[PDB]
Design a protein around this ligand. Sequence first.
Ligand code: MG
Ligand code: MG
Ligand code: MG
Ligand code: MG
Lengths: 369, 369, 369, 369
Amino acid sequence: MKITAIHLYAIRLPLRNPFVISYGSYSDMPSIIVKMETDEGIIGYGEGVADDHVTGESWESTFHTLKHTLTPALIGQNPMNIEKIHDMMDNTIYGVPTAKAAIDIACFDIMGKKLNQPVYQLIGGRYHEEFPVTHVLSIADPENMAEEAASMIQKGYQSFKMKVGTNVKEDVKRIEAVRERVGNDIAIRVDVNQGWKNSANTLTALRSLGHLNIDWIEQPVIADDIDAMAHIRSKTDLPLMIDEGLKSSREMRQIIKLEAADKVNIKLMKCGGIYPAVKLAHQAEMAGIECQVGSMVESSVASSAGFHVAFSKKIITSVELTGPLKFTKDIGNLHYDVPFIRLNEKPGLGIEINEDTLQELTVFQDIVR
Amino acid sequence: MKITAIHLYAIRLPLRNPFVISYGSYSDMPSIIVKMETDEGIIGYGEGVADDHVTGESWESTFHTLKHTLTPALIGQNPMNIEKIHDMMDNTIYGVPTAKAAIDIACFDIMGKKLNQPVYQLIGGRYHEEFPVTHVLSIADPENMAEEAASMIQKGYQSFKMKVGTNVKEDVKRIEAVRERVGNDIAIRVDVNQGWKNSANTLTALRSLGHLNIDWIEQPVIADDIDAMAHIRSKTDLPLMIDEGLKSSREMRQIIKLEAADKVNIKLMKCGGIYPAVKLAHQAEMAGIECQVGSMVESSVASSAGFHVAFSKKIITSVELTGPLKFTKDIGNLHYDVPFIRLNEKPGLGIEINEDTLQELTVFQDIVR
Amino acid sequence: MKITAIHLYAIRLPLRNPFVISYGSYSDMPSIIVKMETDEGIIGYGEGVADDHVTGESWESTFHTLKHTLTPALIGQNPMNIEKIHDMMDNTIYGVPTAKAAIDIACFDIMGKKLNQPVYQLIGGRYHEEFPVTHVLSIADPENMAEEAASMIQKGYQSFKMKVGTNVKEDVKRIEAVRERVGNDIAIRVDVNQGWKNSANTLTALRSLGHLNIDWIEQPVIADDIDAMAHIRSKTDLPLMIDEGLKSSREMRQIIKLEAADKVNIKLMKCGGIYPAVKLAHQAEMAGIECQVGSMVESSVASSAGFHVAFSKKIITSVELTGPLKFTKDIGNLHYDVPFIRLNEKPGLGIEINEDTLQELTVFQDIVR
Amino acid sequence: MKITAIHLYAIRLPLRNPFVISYGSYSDMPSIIVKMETDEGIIGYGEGVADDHVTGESWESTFHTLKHTLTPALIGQNPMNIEKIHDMMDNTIYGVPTAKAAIDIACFDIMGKKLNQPVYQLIGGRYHEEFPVTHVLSIADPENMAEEAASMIQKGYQSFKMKVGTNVKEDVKRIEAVRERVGNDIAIRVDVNQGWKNSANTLTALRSLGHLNIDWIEQPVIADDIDAMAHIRSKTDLPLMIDEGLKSSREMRQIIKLEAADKVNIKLMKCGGIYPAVKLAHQAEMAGIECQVGSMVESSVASSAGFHVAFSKKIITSVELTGPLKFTKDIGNLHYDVPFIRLNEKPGLGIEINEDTLQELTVFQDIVR
Ligand SMILES: [Mg+2]
Ligand SMILES: [Mg+2]
Ligand SMILES: [Mg+2]
Ligand SMILES: [Mg+2]
């Protein structure tokens, strides 16, 4: 098989409400979509949604490194040889995981369609039947968050994720707020997106959260400080999860060596797609580190890609890909049986792309052959 | 898909000459072959060749743990879900990698045949085109080994592996013997199969081998002593490879933590097959540890299984599966283009089993449904 | 002071001869030039030359992250507050050191012009009077390199840098070749640009280079493996320098902690400019790690920026910015008194930009206000 | 530019009230002032206030090492080359940070005046707009301290620093005293100036201070024991700050290596001035250690010098230079907008020296040319 052409679509996925986190507010979500054509007529879709604050890739920058750097080197290349495809990309350019993920995903889509089989079947088979979905509450006021949780509660939701990290004294204020508001049977996990910066602030915050029964604290310090994470872990009994601090096997190695975390948040956009994500899961498994497959706010394309990885691995015990249900328009149709996700048995990503929706969301595009 | 029956064949592969190593001599090679039947009529072949001295599994013991423990729990199970298949096996019994490998291989064979694709395509695609084959010289006298190398030299062979480990003063005697005999362009690697026992003996031996230009020393100390391996590595500039010291991710973790080796020898029979072997490769990759896929003396069935793993991974840079060309009868037809191995494009293991040869080599058998 | 506009020029600097290294060959050098305008009429020039293989930034990608991400956030911002400028950039996007360097340099140019003083005066004053220039010999055949050195020898050159890393047995072949060719008074340093990959290969190579009197070995293993670097350093007496393995303070911290190197190669394009480079020098100083300011093949703009950092710091003992003398056309006029570099006393970068040359080299451009 | 002469003034700054700490009581504050003259008519002021108990420098000793050792070697030297100036001083004499600070400050004053720009503009630009000022309560009785805080409370003050360290059982007595007295919104930090000596006493004291909500504990053990500091940090969740334990990069390196502190108190008098202080800030930044610029009780001269460093660095988050507002007479006019400090835009230290006040406070003097 040979790649004959690659279409690049710089689109914008509309959000029902502004997504608010520690380092920024989002009114919508820019994304790069790729359509990969092969000499065998089989086509695959991939997606790259860049987060400037995490991987240093932007919407426009990703579009262009795909256009001028990665795609030209991929024409004529075989999408069935995933290891080879990644070797070529890594050799032509270092890093740029989001751009590489977009290509990786399309290759697996093509692979699955070609073998008339869902992606998870190409990376280990199906292991999970379903995963519960947890509702992420954007940074809001103590009662505005306690309330948004009250609503989702009466819709089946069993667990929530509170985004905090503006001010320790305030973030705490919001926690017991929703904890009290939802009883003591609703699971609660908190993500501070580096908001507490260092171990001193973090440890101070944690002493005020021991009675609230939090499942785990996610990335409390700045991404680059894995050392701080290990120091925190040495003085607290609250499970710790690393997110921005983990991108590729490079930091995975450090996390294992320093025993910096109880769990890691793997995101296709941080490591370069399905294949690299599988490698991370295998690495985390060796050290008994539990994994989660999270994501940037992504369309059905990347989201399903993430679920396929999740559904195929026993070490992946939680999932956080809810972009498709935050947008008012999606170019794909990944179906959620809220409060659960179950994958169908369809080939490739098991998704259908609405050409009309894609085209109306496209701000600019190009084709490379 | 569902497993409907599993046939177990306890066979014996005849050897052209006695295979001699540090802890034993072999006149032939006992092996367990498995034929897996599915409700879809698709059949797969797997193989388990036990080495009592390495994994504590024997020919008969493997046959029986397969018959009474593993196979009954696998009937009705789906061979397409490799992760699930291994989860079931691990849950019913700990360890027993050789027995599990036999089942793992048959599942991949079925998977490949089902998707009309070679195994390597299911675990990363094709990465390598070919690998050079190195000739293993069994433990013999200084001139008997120097000679056997002289022969293979004039047949294309570019690299050899000397099996040593009876007596340091003697093993050394054999090395310069063949080194001198073959010039200084022929690659030479030495495997002592734990023969030197500890770091003191090993370090003494190594000082007498610095001028001979050896590619690497393989497993010089007793398997369980990873610490000794790291100590040796701290005081020598000769690359070190761990073989018997590595079986599953359990020791891989220790090897990475202690920086005990430059390279590892992965064998499907030590870790439980293709899937576990792929996980080891990914783990070794995180630490920059080069991998080799070696083997016990195996028929075409396990041997091809090993090659499929090797051919799909950039981190695997050398290969050592030469059983098919040491036997006078093989139940399979894996083709070697000595001094190279190249895999064909056929589905599954890309091999054909000669029922007649299988049956004449079978000493006893059973079927489980 | 306020930034009123920023012009972006995607140019291409023509090379007299192809620049060859371990991971690629260059016929010319793509670069992004920035012209920063202020409400006070003072203008500054900056430059960003991306190396896809090191920081994962490309020519086009850098142009765009500058255009759509960094520059819009900088309009109205004060270029005199360098710490503030960097805070703004880091807050809007993570990494992207080459793009940030382009802006950093223009700000210092403006700062120097504004205070009618050379850049080095704004970062510690002048410390060095001059630095010797060493000639870099691109990867060639053993005698083609021995020869190119013979030539430069009779032009004043006192030290050379051999680019190697294709094959250990070959790279070595080239070393004694030029060493023998130039006597034993000519300094020789070797850069393998990750070519030997790991410590095993590296240590093997090093034993064959002990008699050649090499000043230091530069980045012998893959960038991400700082651990391998420390392991190598524990078993060799040859000074080691880290290049690609060092980008920002993030790896500097690791290098210090693990004692992975004797010296580091700081490049404005890897850390984000003059200010971050000064911080690295201060950090390296705390651990007694000697520094060198090297570079990507850059025009007079970034090259002088690098020299200003070098000339102001006692801890920086060698310099490697020779792009201006490899090009057949330069947009600036940095003057080299081969075999030495001395900086003038002119304000800012102390350079003059030839508008005509800039414009003829520009492939595409834009302006942001 | 060239230094033509250096005037040394041994003065005494009168204190409104006796300053009491763990290891001594002060009725006034001896200080050494330097006036540096250049061939360009530009003059700069510097200051050195020695603390015998911290750096082993005394009022008279500093005056003389300046007179007979440092100044003679500086005549004819260029004050614009700060890196060079420090190299010369370090080469002529080791340590003596207070004496060197006095010279360092005058050089920056001259530099700023020469470039008609404030000092902070020469070391990174302006980053901060203002810093809150915290009121330091000298060692007194439990109610005498609770009271002094009650007063300052009704003057805008938002945070206080309690000097303790005479007796654990007593020091604690004073803490809840003022904590109770000022409510739970007033920030409180405690400095024991080595008073608890070791980790045993310290850890015992800390268990009795967990409920009082202290921002951080400063230097609880003897200066030289960085190990004790790390041990304490391993068993407490209270942020720890090192003061006397930190002087130059020498101990900064140790603090980073052993993870001995959450924050450090940088003082120009302990490291040799503005330039060395900036280097410490950059070093602390690499490890994510927060910095504070504190001081000995200093006049407007050194105090402004300290603020210029503070205002230019994001890593410096708190400030403690309140000498100008403890004296009844100051030779300078640094203006405080209690409870805040904001620096003006004037060149150099942005201060004016009252010759008459200087002269009446001078006990003895000399001039060196
Ligand atoms: Mg997160
Ligand atoms: Mg072996
Ligand atoms: Mg280099
Ligand atoms: Mg203090």
